[PDB]
Amino acid sequence: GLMSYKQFIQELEDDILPSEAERRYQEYKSEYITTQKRAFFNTHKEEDWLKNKYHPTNLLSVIERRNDLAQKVAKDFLLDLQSGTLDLGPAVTALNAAPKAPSFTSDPKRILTDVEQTQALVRKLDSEKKIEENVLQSTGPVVIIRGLTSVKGLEGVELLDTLVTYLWRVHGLDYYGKVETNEAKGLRHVRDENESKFDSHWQERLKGQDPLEVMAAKEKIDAAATEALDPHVRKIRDEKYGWKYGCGAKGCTKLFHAAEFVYKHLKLKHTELVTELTTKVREELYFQNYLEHHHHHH
Ligand SMILES: [Zn+2]
Incomplete structure (x- = not known):
C-alpha cells in the first residue's frame, strides 16, 4: 500500500x-x-x-470472435425488427431500472441530432465489423421496415431508440453512456459542459478507428x-x-x-x-x- x-x-x-x-x-x-x-x-x-x-497476437483473434458474434447478433436483431418481435428495452440481450444520461438529453432538438450521429455510428461500426446489409444504415432520416406481416416506418424517437438499442446489443456501444467495451454487460444509459463533449466524444469516434483495433x-x-x-x-x-x-x-x-x-x-x-x-x-x-x-x- x-x-x-x-x-x-x-x-x-x-x-x-x-x-x-x-x-x-x-x-x-x-x-x-x-x-x-x-x-x-x-x-x-x-x-x-x-x-x-x-x-497484439491475441487481440487479432479477440477481434475475429467479436466480429463473428456481432454478425450473428445483427442477423437476429434484424429478424425481430422485421417481425415486430423486437424489444427496445435497455438490456444487452432482452427477453433472454437503468442508469440515466445527463439531463441535457430531455431536449427534443437533441433527438434530431442524436438520430444522425447514431445512424452515423451504426454505419461506421457495421463497416468495421463487416456487417454488410442493414436497413438501419429536406428531412430527417426515414427507415422503412418491410416485414413478414406488415410495414413499419421509423422516424424520430422510435428510430432513435431502435438505433441506440442496436448499437448496444450488437456493438456494445452505450450511446448515452459515452462508452464502448468489447463484451458489454447489463443496462445501457437511457434518457454547455456535457453537450459539447458528448458530441466530441462520438464525433472523434466517427473520425478515428476501432479502439480494439488501435490496441492491436x-x-x-x-x-x-x-x-x-x-x-x-x-x-x-x-x-x-x-x-x-x-x-x-x-x-x-x-x-x-x-x-x-x-x-x-x-x-x-x-x-x-x-x-x-x-x-x-x-x-x-x-x-x-x-x-x-x-x-x-x-
Ligand atoms: Zn528461404
Whole structure:
C-alpha cells in the first residue's frame, strides 16, 4: 500500500530536512508505483485474460470472435425488427431500472441530432465489423421496415431508440453512456459542459478507428516485423530484369522479383527464424498496452 506522506517521514526524523524529505518521498512514490505495475504485470503476463486485453497476437483473434458474434447478433436483431418481435428495452440481450444520461438529453432538438450521429455510428461500426446489409444504415432520416406481416416506418424517437438499442446489443456501444467495451454487460444509459463533449466524444469516434483495433496495432507490428527481416533479404541486380531479391536464410537459395515476396516467404518457410526476430516488439507492445490502458489501484 502507498504510504501517506506522514508515514514515510518517520524512519528518517533523526537529522531532519524538510525539502530533502519531499525529494525522497516523491522518488519513493515514483519508484513504488512503477514497481507495483511491473509486479502485477509479471504475476499475470502469462494468463489469457490479460493477453486477450493487451497482447497484439491475441487481440487479432479477440477481434475475429467479436466480429463473428456481432454478425450473428445483427442477423437476429434484424429478424425481430422485421417481425415486430423486437424489444427496445435497455438490456444487452432482452427477453433472454437503468442508469440515466445527463439531463441535457430531455431536449427534443437533441433527438434530431442524436438520430444522425447514431445512424452515423451504426454505419461506421457495421463497416468495421463487416456487417454488410442493414436497413438501419429536406428531412430527417426515414427507415422503412418491410416485414413478414406488415410495414413499419421509423422516424424520430422510435428510430432513435431502435438505433441506440442496436448499437448496444450488437456493438456494445452505450450511446448515452459515452462508452464502448468489447463484451458489454447489463443496462445501457437511457434518457454547455456535457453537450459539447458528448458530441466530441462520438464525433472523434466517427473520425478515428476501432479502439480494439488501435490496441492491436497490426499495421505498426507488420511494419516492425518487416524491418527486422531486412538483414535477411539480399538485394541483387539482374542483367536484364532490374532488381531481384534473394532470401538470406541458410541452406536457402530461392529468388524473388519483389521484396514483399521474400518477407512472405520467410514467415512460411522459416517460421522460427521469424518468431525469434520479432518477439521483442510484440512483447514490448504487450507491456506498453497494459501500462497505458489498465486501471491500477494505488
Ligand atoms: Zn528461404
